């Protein structure tokens, strides 16, 4: 398992949590020095448990699929909650079995579906460590509209920070003050599957992307990624989605 406590949290302790989260995801190889997530994991081993504590020390446990860093569902006290999608229904056979009741949320975990349920797109929802405190508090007691927003904060401050060093550093900048995600943050979230695919294809194409990827850089400017010498490949991306799952 991995844990993060908002009480006494600082940029350093958040960084240690994101390092713990990356290190809990299995890999058999690295592609251009980036861990390659597994094509498949059978049984309960597919799911990592993340224990998150708000400023007041109240806790949820979040189940994460270790093949793709997707959040499946979470446990709050004696109630489990799962996304309305087949991967999450399967997860509910293995995690949080001892919950008194299991609620299926009225949405999948897709960003587009969560944004419709929340009533706002990601670009308008402030993120940061205070926002994550609020999200844990929201998820402790069922409210499906509030939960959608809280889940968009939770996904970006955990899974997306695990995937990209830049996003980890953006949340560190928001340790004591929330701010809507940067243009580069949204670009990277949207591009993870595409970048993962092109980096794996670059093995066999001399490090050259078969299809260049258009991103937004840390200054808000267009950058076209053509090959593995790009900063996004050498420094930023931390995990690759296996091409078998694309
Ligand atoms: N259970 C989930 N199902 C689908 N997407 C999820 C889930 N949990 C978190 N996400 C995020 O929603 C996003 C939608 O497709 P993405 O390529 O952007 O990557 C995904 C994940 O980062």
Swiss-Prot record:
Its EC number is 3.2.2.22. Gene3D superfamilies: Ricin (A subunit), domain 1, Ricin (A Subunit), domain 2. The active site is at residue 160. Glycans are attached at residue 227. The keyword Glycosyltransferase does not apply. It catalyses: Endohydrolysis of the N-glycosidic bond at one specific adenosine on the 28S rRNA. It is an enzyme of class 3 (hydrolase). The keyword Zinc-finger does not apply. Belongs to the ribosome-inactivating protein family. Type 1 RIP subfamily. This is Ribosome-inactivating protein momordin I. It comes from Momordica charantia.
């Amino acid at each position: 398992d991995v844990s993060f406590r908002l009480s006494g949290a600082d940029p350093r302790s958040y960084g240690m949590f994101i390092k713990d989260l990356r290190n809990a995801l299995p890999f058999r190889e690295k592609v251009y020095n980036i861990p390659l997530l597994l094509p498949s994991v059978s049984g309960a081993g597919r799911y990592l448990l993340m224990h998150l504590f708000n400023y007041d020390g109240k806790t949820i446990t979040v189940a994460v699929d270790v093949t793709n860093v997707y959040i499946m569902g979470y446990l709050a006290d004696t109630t489990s909650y799962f996304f309305n999608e087949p991967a999450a229904e399967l997860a509910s056979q293995y995690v949080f079995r001892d919950a008194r009741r299991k609620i299926t949320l009225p949405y999948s975990g897709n960003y587009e579906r969560l944004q419709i349920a929340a009533g706002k797109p990601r670009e308008k929802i402030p993120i940061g460590l205070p926002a994550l405190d609020s999200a844990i508090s929201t998820l402790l007691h069922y409210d499906s509209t509030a939960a959608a927003g809280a889940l968009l904060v939770l996904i970006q401050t955990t899974a997306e920070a695990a995937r990209f060093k830049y996003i980890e550093q953006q949340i560190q900048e928001r340790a004591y003050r929330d701010e809507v995600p940067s243009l580069a943050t949204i670009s990277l979230e949207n591009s993870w599957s595409g970048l993962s695919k092109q980096i794996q294809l670059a093995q066999g194409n001399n490090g050259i992307f078969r299809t260049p990827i258009v991103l937004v850089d840390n200054k808000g400017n267009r950058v076209q990624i053509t090959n593995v010498t790009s900063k996004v490949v050498t420094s930023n991306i931390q995990l690759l989605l296996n091409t078998r799952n694309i």
